[PDB]
Amino acid sequence: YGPDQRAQKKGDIILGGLFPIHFGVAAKDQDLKSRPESVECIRYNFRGFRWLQAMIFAIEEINSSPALLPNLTLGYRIFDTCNTVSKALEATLSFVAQNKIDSLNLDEFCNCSEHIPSTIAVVGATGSGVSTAVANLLGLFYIPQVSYASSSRLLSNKNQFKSFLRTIPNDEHQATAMADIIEYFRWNWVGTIAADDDYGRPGIEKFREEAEERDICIDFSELISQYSDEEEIQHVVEVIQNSTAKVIVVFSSGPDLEPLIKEIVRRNITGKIWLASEAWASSSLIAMPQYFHVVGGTIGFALKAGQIPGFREFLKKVHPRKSVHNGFAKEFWEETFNCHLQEFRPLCTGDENISSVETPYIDYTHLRISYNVYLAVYSIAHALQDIYTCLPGRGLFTNGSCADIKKVEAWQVLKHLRHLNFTNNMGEQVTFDECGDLVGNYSIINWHLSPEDGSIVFKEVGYYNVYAKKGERLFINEEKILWSGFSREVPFSNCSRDCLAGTRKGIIEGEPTCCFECVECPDGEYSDETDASACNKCPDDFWSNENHTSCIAKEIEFLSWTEPFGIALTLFAVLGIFLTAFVLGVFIKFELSYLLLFSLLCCFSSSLFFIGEPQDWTCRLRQPAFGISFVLCISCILVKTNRQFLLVFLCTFMQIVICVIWLYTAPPSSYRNQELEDEIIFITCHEGSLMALGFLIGYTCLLAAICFFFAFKSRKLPENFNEAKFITFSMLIFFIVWISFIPAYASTYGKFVSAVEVIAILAASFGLLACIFFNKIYI
Template sequence: MRLYLKVHLVLLALNCGVLSYGPRQRAQKTGDILLGGLFPIHFRVASNDQDLAAKPESTECVRYNFRGFRWLQAMIFAIEEINNSSTLLPNITLGYSIFDTCNTVSKALEASLSFVAQNKIDSLNLDGFCNCTGNIPSTIAVVGASGSAVSTAVADLVGLFYIPQISYASSSRLLSNKNQYKSFMRTIPTDEYQAIAMAAIIDHFQWNWVIAIASDDEYGRPGIEKFENEMLERDICIDLNVLISQYLEEAEIIRIADQIQNSTAKVIVVFASGPDVEPLVKEMVRRNITDRVWLASEAWALSSLVAKPEYLDVMGGTIGFALQAGQIPGFKKFLQQVHPKKSLHNEFVREFWEETFNCYLVDSVRKEDSENGSAGFRPLCTGEEDITSVETPYLDYTHLRISYNVYVAVYAIAEALQDILTCTPGRGLFANGSCADIRKVEAWQVLKQLRHLKFQNSLGERVRFDESSELAANYTIMNWHRSPADGSVVFREVGYYSVSGKKGAKLSIDKTKILWNGYLTEVPFSNCSEECEPGTRKGIIEGKPTCCFECTECSDGEYSEHKDASPSRNTIEEVRSSTAAHAFKAAAKATLRQSSAFRKRSSSVCGSSASSPSSSFCMKTNENEAATPTGQRRSQRPRHKLLAGISQSWLRKQYNSVYKSELYHRLEISFVYQTPQLDL
């Protein structure tokens, strides 16, 4: 497969039309050094299949993504900021070529071909053969993509040519494999930490019966697999495991919703992207299933596709993960200054303007609008519209998370280029300590420099891209509330999860801030079985997981002094605890203080622990024996069975100091495994 791609790209590079290859719509500006960008400006591609009656065109994208456009703007803002700097890359101008992935692998690859093709021409020195004109620089690094599935495909392609790729939102742990993805880096922590954090939250609320749902891609599958392993280690059970996608047929969505509705598990863990989880949420809302708790991965925890006021009756109380927010000084003003007449290098601005104000600009009616007539229902844009007068996710800059990751990615590339610019011959990273020429720098040289880069971002985090590095995992835990003012969705911070190399992982949750669905404050119940009360024990239900059990009364000779006691061998272990030892001692002492003669066979002696009055147990009496006054010795000790399976040395250690003179000499241990029993 890789060999085929390589041959195909060599042929593509011979084509002088390579510079115009790729999607028509793009943001592009020339410079001394060119950076590529991949962003989800739309959520998906149109589903209509081309019949090939004419030459096929690039697939249209649908459903505008305002946050994706903000991420693109963050890249342009960072580049312009660097170009205006007198200390970082002075006299060097960065250019950019940015494409829309439409959150789809095919569109991302279509765009990525334009990155690698010019690099191939430069590396093979074929200008004389193809008679190309113009001096267009190679793309020396790519910022993107967003989804892990998209980034994985792009990494396979650009990695062939050692073009560094820095993703701002792809967290799949599969991408940590440096042997497979040689040129891939990221400014987001791997979701391996997030899976552990999800399991920690389940444990924190003492749930043991959950539903696990994941995107059927490189993000969801590895993430939920790690989560399942964490559940196994914590003895927590998963009732239902489902893979979803935005491209599932309606019948399949209905089938999955049926399974969820019929499940007794009330907690739904979803490791998926917003577009993938949206169809399922719509079906749950249609059915008005309100008795569930949703636990959201960061890919959809703040998604505008799902966090809608009309969904809150079902989705209210959702607990989700959010990346640590950063600050970008001056970015707010930059976002507010966007305008079709001012942003001549950014073709995405025109569509953004039309979608924001529900109007259309002259000569910008798109193909899909003309075909369905939607343009006729929109007024003409005046150009005087005020971007600050509307509410849009584009202007949600109070908590910059992904936008900040984009900003850091661009600065990482600039810092690597700065190291090349200021390199001292003899101390460089290349052969014999040589330095790369900043005016003729190639992608592989930038990749080498990035692997040795170490710098601090504005949050104080150390950013490095060596083979063993991963960013520290710091998540904010959010709770979905309904605003009492206007009914909108409010994301309230209720805790955090952080991982430090020295201190380990820490989960902190303020339960008093959490509102569960229906404005409830009591933690919902999501366990397969009710806990067993003292005096009963867990009984296995054949064909069910260990989290599902029935409570049965203790048999003669058994006791349980706390809730959820386990049968057989576990009961012995419970007796080893100090409270169980006290309970036994109290019972033994009470027995010895009975009448001057032992009771006859089948009579029973019951007692309770002074240290734990709620715990109770019964001890069976044995053969009819001669009366012996308490405190007197007998020449022949009677045989007794006491807590079979417990060693005599352990018994001596526990009881000898207190009851040696009165109790120990009256006991004899039978080392046959059975439930604890005392025969008198």
């Protein structure tokens, strides 16, 4: 009853089932001026009719085989939901009629002797919003509903849907797989579009939750339908164009993506690559070659293919007249042949060949959902069989007491369906869990343009083994994948391009983390990693490179030990010591010849003890550069004509005591400074307050000025071959050297602050020897 397009056949036990023979209802709206009448469905679904044939086929095979349910035939009242909740509820109200005794005891019947014998288990409602509406109704009467293609996670909530089983995997696996795919191809900037019903809406929440643990931040999320208006589709495609994310994850059904794909190919937005949900990844409404400019190379999902024998030929035996138990065969025939059956459109002969025309009823490669229909009706049969072969004292009910077959109630069938364990034709075990659902392995496909009048061929490119460990479930042989239909390289789909190791990562205010900016980091970068969030700081021994990479450029080594700018001065000091030694040999062969020889050799020989890399000892050894000059300058008070003569310890020991007092004041320690940036490693010996200044002013600025005060009366006086004038010239030369020393010493640094001191000491020690020894020898 109810609708007048059934597929009815009697039996001892009647199943019943629901199928999408059409695609939706007529788009006309009731203004409710007249009495509102039944809406007509509009498009036609050959794949849905094939699914109906798959249910019918297994019913006939069970009824023919005596090895399963003998002496007992099965019936079916298959209705047709035109993919809508209203058309589904119209049918499943006629399912529960003889069951309407419990609450409404006012049934009275008065309509049939068998009173429309009760259905025992419905099969289906492919739509997930359809099954949610039907299972609310069939949970009052505990009739088991075995869906074949409704696959949302809301239906696995057994406090509300108390009688619901399904032979399709849940969608907590598929939304994980579409996160693992993006994690495998390494994108981080995607977009989501879901159908606004119970298939896409809770299926995209799982994807949003499971693509934030992998930090794939999502650009946009928009909801579509199949009854949306042009402003909504406009808003959606403006969001699509207005963003830059090439990977779009569409979690939607077949005919709900149709108004979006129509509009996008009408506006020619080429470039986006679509991940596909399981519903429309193999869909004859989107797999059209005129759409291939935009939809191409879409990575999809499909369930594991099944094998049904003889079903291919059972499909061929269809006829509008020969099928008495099939109300849909006629409208199928006149749809596939554009006829008009009699009992614009030509009248139909009724002898046509179905394999002539091309239609998705028979043009197919793999049984996927038809296998699930087949498995569902076999599972109902095997639960009935395990009711049929139960012995007393062994059953599943109270006190082990099982029940009969001829008076069987639906809750018993549900009880035996919960504890099911049986084997396929493909030899696999089939069990429903505590939430009543199979688990299977998806087979990832890819849409290819078959270039010999073929519309679109689906090339299998991998799988997704849900049985394996987490982290390793996804195997993609990615040699076959033609991104956007033709290409071979993986398209870029990040938000910002990952820039190099010269820079760190800086951000934009109010934007997701998957796109950034990158700015170079200065003065000690050592930015070693490729996508560092903050480049490090260089260690104190090194300085950053030109291109700011890892700092192996180290600091300075300013010592000047064997440098060619100091080796010549070392040679000059050696020649000065040797010129002192030859004069010593002449003055030995042929106290003023002893002390003013030895100390004058010492002040010229120990001057080379301050060139190179300093330390504690070589930094404390700069006070003998005053002490040896103090002893060598005793000639100016010892060799005068107005000369007891060994009393030079009146001032030399005073200088030694001042140096001993300054050894605590100024340090015996070389100190580094960092005055430049890159090569600024120095050593400068850090004279404390005034120690060297006081020593110099107490010895060398005093001895020459005292000798000038005594030889101011001797410079205009010849004595001992003009030794007075020669000593006055030597004192003036030493005063000139110490006048040249001071500001050039005070204004320079590092390598060039020891070189001036050693040059001044060599100048004094060479001058005091040359103005004395040559005049004393050659005369």
